[PDB]
Amino acid sequence: QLGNLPGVTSMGMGYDVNGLYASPESLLGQPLFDFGGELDSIEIEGRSYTFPRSMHVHTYFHSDFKQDVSKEIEEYREKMSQHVGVSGRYKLFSASLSVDFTTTDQQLTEITYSSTREAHVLWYISLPGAATLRSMLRRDFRDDLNNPNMPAMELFKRYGPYYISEAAVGGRLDYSAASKTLKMDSSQSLSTTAEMSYKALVGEIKIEHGSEMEKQVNSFRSNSTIRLTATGGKPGMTDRILHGPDSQQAFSQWAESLLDYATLMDFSTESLQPIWALADKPERRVELEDAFPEFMKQSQQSIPKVDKVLLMDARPPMVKAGEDSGSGASEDLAVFNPSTSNGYKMVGQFGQRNHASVADGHAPIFKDLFDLGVLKAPVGWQRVWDDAGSGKSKDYACWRAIPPQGYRALGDVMMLATSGYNPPNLPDYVCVHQSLCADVQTLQNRVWWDKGTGARKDVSLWQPGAAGAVASSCFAGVPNYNNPPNSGDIERLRGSIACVKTSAIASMQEMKSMLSQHQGM
Amino acid sequence: QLGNLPGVTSMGMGYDVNGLYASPESLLGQPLFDFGGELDSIEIEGRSYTFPRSMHVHTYFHSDFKQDVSKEIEEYREKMSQHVGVSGRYKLFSASLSVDFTTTDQQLTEITYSSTREAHVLWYISLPGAATLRSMLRRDFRDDLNNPNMPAMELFKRYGPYYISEAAVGGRLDYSAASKTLKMDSSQSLSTTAEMSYKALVGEIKIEHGSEMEKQVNSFRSNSTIRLTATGGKPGMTDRILHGPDSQQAFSQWAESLLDYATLMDFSTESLQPIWALADKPERRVELEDAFPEFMKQSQQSIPKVDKVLLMDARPPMVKAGEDSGSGASEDLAVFNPSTSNGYKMVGQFGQRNHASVADGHAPIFKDLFDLGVLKAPVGWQRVWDDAGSGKSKDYACWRAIPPQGYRALGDVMMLATSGYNPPNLPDYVCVHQSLCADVQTLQNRVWWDKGTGARKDVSLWQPGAAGAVASSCFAGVPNYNNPPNSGDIERLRGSIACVKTSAIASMQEMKSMLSQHQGM
Amino acid sequence: QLGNLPGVTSMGMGYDVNGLYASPESLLGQPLFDFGGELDSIEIEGRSYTFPRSMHVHTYFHSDFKQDVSKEIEEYREKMSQHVGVSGRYKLFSASLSVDFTTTDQQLTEITYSSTREAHVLWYISLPGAATLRSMLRRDFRDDLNNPNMPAMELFKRYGPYYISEAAVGGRLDYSAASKTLKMDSSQSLSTTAEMSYKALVGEIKIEHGSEMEKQVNSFRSNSTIRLTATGGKPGMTDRILHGPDSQQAFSQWAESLLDYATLMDFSTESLQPIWALADKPERRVELEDAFPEFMKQSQQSIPKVDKVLLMDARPPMVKAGEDSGSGASEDLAVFNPSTSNGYKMVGQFGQRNHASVADGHAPIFKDLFDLGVLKAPVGWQRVWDDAGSGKSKDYACWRAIPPQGYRALGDVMMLATSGYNPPNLPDYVCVHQSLCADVQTLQNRVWWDKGTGARKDVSLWQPGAAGAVASSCFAGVPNYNNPPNSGDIERLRGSIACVKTSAIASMQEMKSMLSQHQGM
């Protein structure tokens, strides 16, 4: 097809709707239409550009800004496919996913997927409707399209199920981010932070050193995998814009280059039009259209997800962390911390109704394997109970982790035989994100209570449990001697203490096995 | 000429942007462009059509539904002008106002303006962009457009400041309503009621007799002025659809007629394009564009409004409505109702510190002249005070109108020397809509209090007042003997009692005079 | 991409050197080079074009006129292959032969082959030299090119032995003619007539009705097979330029279209460059270059020729055409004409030294089977001898055909016992073109002489012969009694009388057999 206006060669081409988003790379071989040799022209900066009179050109020298953001990869895919002309609610452009995101991040959970796109439109080119184009078909496309013995799948492989009917021409930048939001001071919206980061990068804004915006953007950048992909424009500029020496200059070079390097780079609601509408016979239009779901079947499969994000070690070394000796409580209590290393973290104490030097069991430790921020340190500690009133010279207390917003603690910590109510000093204690935990349902197998001590306040240490949660090795204080604890005592724990789901957890070996069924990890 | 496809003759014509909404009646004389003598032909549902090669046709047999609704005429006008391609925030299509609404309703206040439009699109026709059309100008338009000595105003008179670049072709119905919402059980949104009324009318829905939807639609219809205007389609059908025997059939006749009577009838965001974009020189584009505000000046004037909606009689006959004789209160109290007739309404009692048979002053009465529902009966009455504990055989009480939602009472009513606490029986008492009233600011010139009566509860009758409100002749009870009342006593009155604004009020003669400066009233 | 400058996609492509002359149709699949993604832009007649920085563009809006003309097909082929960059003396572009000429004309002899080409160059595109391109090879081409186990033949099949290094871009017309010049008033050169015919066709000249040039061009056209082939330019124009109603307008449409339809259409001396020069190792360059002769072997076969263009009937009916009765010559003479029909032609009389009613032998007759104009009537007849002075009342004469320019007579005709010196009246007597004849070498087997008649002038009839000529059945007069005739008598015959070559002649059966080995005749 004819004339020298950039983009003209993309018009009326078949498109791989499962390929890249609005890129020439996903155009398919054969032109579908013969657009006629008569040409129109337009003047741009002193020069003439020609294109077929059968196309319409609308100059719009301006920037379209778009964001698709989601915590859920499948919703991201849907959002990215909206308003490009493909009827149905298909997840299109599957090949762009691996352009925009690592295969690991696609499959990881707790990742936010953002595509922040700035389209530098020079002009839009648009074709006539199906019924006009019907008389403009190239010979072998017309034959294949209208042959009833040419099956839909072949037709769609040869020509694409959709063709380019309208396109924005110029250059586009895609600032795509896989963000670990749980690590990210998450007050301001991710999409706004992404916008600002992109705009600072290309110099549309300057961020003042030491600002709140700088903090927010630095957090985004250092806790995301970020790519910059250019469709159209001078090639090999994106590495310099993203990282390299002078990003604002490299960007302005790409921007000023657009007229010489313009390509199809964006879609509107009318961009992709089905080839079936071009068929002569209604029966053929319909049979081709009916076949689209099966053509798309492979592309509509979900991305596989890694739900098992906590690496468990159920038998770490247990070290003694106090006895209730001197407390005057009838029962003996000893507590034990698990020793932690290699990024494994404590979630609770192991408790015993005795004074032994050795733990009766093990408190598991968990590691945030994929560094998603699903484990986060507590913001502080509060008292479930202390021995005020017992008159004993030494002090005995039950403490709770105060979790940061969105997280939960899995077990309390006793501080026994102390000089003053010293709070837990447990650098490797963490709370676990809500998403991985279930609210406590049962409280069973009482470890201990303070009765006999003669303290005003009361406490009993109980083993929490939930539907689907790991059989806990930890305890939670209830401020009374109810046996068993009632649903009011269980309600009190909601939002603060929880149990960790089996679906979020795996041992060293279960993790190896689960991961070996996910490509590129 | 330009082929036989309906709509083609509208394309590339100047448009009166101050005329009707997307109608051929507002096309302007001179063709702007030479579209080539070459024609395409197209088959559209069994019929053959021709049109210029340079235009694009998109067939889409479907209905677009749109609503612009507002309580404020100027906002309605803005809403109606959105997304038709005219940059700026201009109020377009001023001539449609008198098509859609009576001149009275336009100027009345408390009216909700709705345009509910159903566009029956057969196809869209669209032109090239400005830059392509630049080489396709007719000779005299090119000369005038580009001549620097041809002033903007003439150019705009001759050609229109905007031209039709894209249009929907078929037929449109405009179901336009001037609704008196204060009379209208206003729980469900007006726009939804308007939608349902239109849809029932043309048979897209059926409304079940005795339903909630029927009540809502009946209320809409009998408290609105409603018009149905057709652009395109067989003429003289709107009367039968709106009123006459079988509106669903009359509508289906208009709908099936559209192929023979199709015209330009709707605009999209790209429909109206400025002629200035067609000028060769940037200086000329700019000077033409700068002249647009003055071209539009007359059209942007506000619609004149009737703010004075209450007809006041400040000196009606006062009739006695009781004394505190037998109450044992130190002070004497007598109260007087104004006599009401001819749709004039009582808003409060006149109160006196004496036992006279004659009123010392007058309590004004007000008439809802334009039947806007700005006066509405109270939903009930509650007691500010009674004489419980005084031990007197007869009863004495101060009552407040409980206003319906959105209204306010202007004065309380005493019930004095009664057998049981009988509530006021005042068929012509009304509350006044919020919009016409100001919250009470002062409480002055105490009329009376009950001290001496020996009742547990206390009351003092005070004259309310506000900045800009008519000097009240009524009273309000405060449940204590504070002298003067404090800001807590004044706060208690907020949302219940108010004073009526001078701006909402006029005497018989002021109303005649004010109305004589509004056309058609 | 490689930019939008027409021609760019042809650059650095393999070329089928045995295909068409400078056409995109003979480009071969895989691009050889990676030209860099950096693009220059250039202004060409108001329009902007892009192309790879590594290529050079030279605009030169002009017409190159070229003719390759030859009587000999193999020389035509050589001429057409000159100055395109292919070292050696190869006959290139063999596929253009059947584009330009019918297969019959290719194989026929006495055909003049002309290609008259008018190349409308817009620009040249040129690549770097071999040594620069060596670092720009695509991966698989580099691997194959430099792999010593990849044989030359495969390499050449996959990539082509030569690539496009420099090309003219625009449109070319090829006015190709297979001319039967022997039918063609051949005074002015064929190449000039071809030039004028082409130039009149496209309107670069107008030829005046009734002119010498009109006669010459009409003769060319009606005695040639003529084709017009366009490389580049608006397609489907050549039929109208060649034949149809307005050829000068159709040509001007093609000419003004060139900018929109420009392609590679001409080669210069640097256009085709060998792939072997791109190989890293000199040993590899050499082995690839050594293999070129065998790659080209099939293409260098000669076109099969039909040299046997006279259909002979050696035994036609012989009818008596006079005796020398009454002449007084000692010897008897009788002569016989062969009867002619069906386009067979007489070349001479049979002569006898007797008075018999029956011929002692046969004079062959010949037919111009392929209508090449190898036989042409004589322009007149002159006397070798008459019986003036014998005093006999009746007359006796020997006549010679005066051949038209370029032809020869094979035998004389006696006119015996006539009333007045009446010249031969032999409508079917012809001379034979020079090309098929050999000058007379011997004169043997005297038939007769006039001695005894007593005529001033003398004559002897001798049988002519030559190396390679058919043993003649005809005679030639020598104006004396030399026995045998001397080399002066033989010289006198040169340019006028000749003998017909065995190589030009075949009987009905030999012709059938010879023709059955030539496809499509």
Q: For residue C187, what are its two tokens?
A: 């005074």
CB atoms within 10 A of CB A28: 19
Longest dimension (CA), chain C: 103
Q: Classify residue A388 by its DSSP letter.
A: T
Which residues of A fall within a CB distance of 8 Å from B270?
A: 58
Distance CA(C504)–CA(C492), nearest Å, equals 24
**Helix B212-222, helix B190-201: angle, nearest 10:** 90
Identify residues after which chain A is interrupted (C–N over 2.5 A): none
Residues of chain C in contact with residue A260, where contact means CB-CB under 8 angstroms, are 39, 41, 48, 50
Question: Angle CA(B487)–CA(B492)–CA(B497) in degrees, nearest 5?
Answer: 110
Residue B160's region, left for phi above 0, alpha for psi from -120 to 50, else beta, is: left
How far is the alpha carbon of B58 from chain A, nearest alpha carbon, in Å? 5
Residue C423 vs residues B341, C380, C492: alpha-carbon distances, Å: 146, 9, 21
Residue matched to tokens 């547990």: B456
Rounded distance between C-alpha atoms, residue B510 and residue B111, angstroms: 22
Q: Does A9 touch chain C (CB under 8 A)?
A: yes
Query: Among B512, B508, B503, which Cα is nearest to B109's?
Result: B503
Cβ–Cβ below 8 Å for C43 and A39: no
| Alpha-carbon gap, residue C165 to C144, rounded angstroms | 20
The continuous run of DSSP H or E covering B439 comes out as strand B437-439
CA distances from B13 to B168, B284, B306, B393 (A): 14, 21, 38, 87
User: A54 vs B59: CB contact, 8 Å cut-off?
Assistant: no
- Burial class of A299 by CB neighbour count within 10 A (0 to 12, 13 to 18, 19+): middle
Report CB contact under 8 Å: A56, B126. yes
Among residues A146, A388, A496, A140, which one has the least CA distance to residue A287? A146
CA angle A380, A381, A385 (to 5 degrees): 165
Closest partner CB to A48 (pick from C39, C47, C234): C47
Verify A-C touch: 3 or more CB pairs within 8 A.
yes
Tokens coding A111: 């990742």
Residues of C in contact with A234 (CB under 8 A): 37-38
Distance CA C163, CA C264 (A): 13
Residues of B in contact with A59 (CB under 8 A): 129-131
Contact: C39, A261; criterion CB under 8 Å: yes
For residues B7-20, b (16+ Cβ closer than 10 Å) or e, as one string? bbbbbbbbbbbbbb
**CB-CB under 8 Å, B44 with A132:** no
Contact criterion met (CB below 8 Å) for A173 and A228: yes
Dist. CA B492–CA B497, nearest whole Å? 9
Closest-CA residue in chain C for A232?
C1
Contact A258, A120 (CB under 8 A): yes
At C115, is the secondary structure helix, strand, or coil? strand
In angstroms, the CA B325 to CA B417 distance is: 7
Q: What would you measure as the largest C-alpha separation in chain A, in angstroms?
A: 103
Sheet with C334-338, side-by-side order of all strands: C318-323, C334-338, C350-352
Check the CA dihedral A322-A324-A325-A330 and report its sign: negative
Contact, C406 vs C110, CB < 8 A? no
> How far is B501 from B491, CA to CA, in rounded Å?
19
Residues of chain A numbered 40-79 and touching chain C (CB < 8 Å)? 47-50
User: Do the beta carbons of residue C89 and residue C275 sit within 8 Å?
Assistant: no
| Residues with Cβ within 8 Å of residue C231, at least 6 apart in sequence | C20, C22, C23, C24, C171, C172, C174, C263, C264, C265
**Gap between the Cα atoms of B321 and B428, Å rounded:** 14
Q: Which residue of C has its CA nearest to A262?
A: C3
Cβ of C38 under 8 Å from any chain A Cβ? yes
Maximum distance among all Cα pairs of chain B, rounded to whole angstroms? 103
Cβ neighbours, 10 Å, residue B397: 26
Q: Which of A267, A287, A318, A356 is nearest to A474 (CA)?
A: A318
Among A430, A431, A411, CA closest to A476 = A411
Residue B121 bridge partners (DSSP): B62, B170
Amino acid at A420: G
CA distance, residue A55 to nearest chain B CA (Å): 8
Chains in contact with B via at least 3 Cβ–Cβ pairs below 8 Å: A
Residue listed under structure tokens 């809502």 = B216
Answer whether A432's CB lies under 8 Å from A366's CB: yes
CA C90/CA C71 separation, integer angstroms: 19
Q: What is the 3-state secondary structure (H, E, C) of B201-257?
A: HCCCCCCCCCCHHHHHHHHHHHCEEEEEEEECCCCCCHHHHHCCCCHHHHHHHHHHH
- Closest-CA residue to B501 (of B439, B442, B458, B451): B439
| CB B147, CB B19: distance < 8 Å | no
B57 CA to chain A: closest CA distance, Å?
A: 6
Q: Do chains C and B touch (3 or more CB pairs under 8 A)?
A: no
Query: What are the beta bridge partners of residue A177?
Result: A114, A226
Which residue among C37, C39, C234 sits closest to A37, beta carbon to beta carbon? Answer: C234
Specify whether the CB–CB gap between C462 and C499 falls below 8 A: no
Strand order of the β-sheet with C395-402 is C380-386, C395-402, C413-418
Q: Which residues in chain A are contacts of C234 at CB distance < 8 A? A: 37
- CA of A223 vs chain C CAs: smallest distance (Å): 34
Residue of A nearest to B124 (CA): A129
Alpha-carbon distance of C167 to A293, in angstroms, equals 48
Alpha helices in C451-520 (DSSP H): 487-492, 508-516
Question: Tokens 């729980």 appear where?
Answer: B187
* Cβ atoms of residues A304 and A327 within 8 Å: no
Of C416, C418, C403, C422, the residue nearest C349 (C-alpha): C416
Inter-chain contact A56–B134, Cβ cutoff 8 Å?
no
Show the DSSP H helices in A102-206 as ranges. Answer: 103-107, 130-133, 139-146, 152-159, 190-201
> Is the backbone of residue B320 left (phi > 0), alpha (psi -120 to 50) or beta?
beta
Give the burial string for A350-385 (b: 16+ CB within 10 Å, else e).
bbbeeeeeebeebbbbbbbbbebbbbbbbeebebbb
DSSP structural state of residue A357: S
Tell how far CA A361 is from the center of its chain.
37
Q: Name every chain A residue with its beta carbon within 8 A of the beta carbon of B126.
A: 56
Phi-psi region of B502 (alpha: psi -120 to 50; beta: other; left: phi over 0): alpha
Which helix (H) or strand (E) is B146 found in, with range? helix B139-146
**Distance in angstroms (rounded) separating the CA atoms of residues B29 and B6:** 18
Contact A128 B53 (CB under 8 A): no
Distance of residue A172 Cα from the nearest chain B Cα, in angstroms: 22
Residues β-bridged to residue A172: A119, A231
Task: Give CA–CA dist A132/A129, Å, rounded.
Answer: 6
Distance, in Å, from the CA atom of B92 to the CA atom of C176, rounded to the nearest integer, reads: 68
Q: What is the resolution of this structure in A?
A: 2.5
Cβ pair A127, A272 in contact under 8 A:
no
Q: State both tokens at B303.
A: 């619609």
Q: What single string gives the DSSP state of each residue in B77-115?
A: HHHHTTTSS--SS----HHHHHHHS-HHHHHBSS-EEEE
Phi and psi at residue C460, to the nearest 5°: -135, 135
Contact B409, B376 (CB under 8 A): no
The two structure tokens encoding residue B407? 């209204």
Q: Which two tokens stand for residue B515?
A: 């109305």
**H or E element at residue A416:** strand A413-418
- Phi then psi for A171, rounded to 5 degrees? -140, 150
Across the interface, of A42, A53, A129, the residue whose CB is closest to B53 is A53
Q: How far is CA C88 from CA A394, A406, C97, C140, C289, in A?
A: 109, 83, 20, 28, 11
Q: Do A131 and B54 touch (CB under 8 A)?
A: no
- CA triple A70-A73-A78, angle to 5 deg: 80
* Tokens linked to C169: 């871009």
- Which residue bears the tokens 């279209």? C257
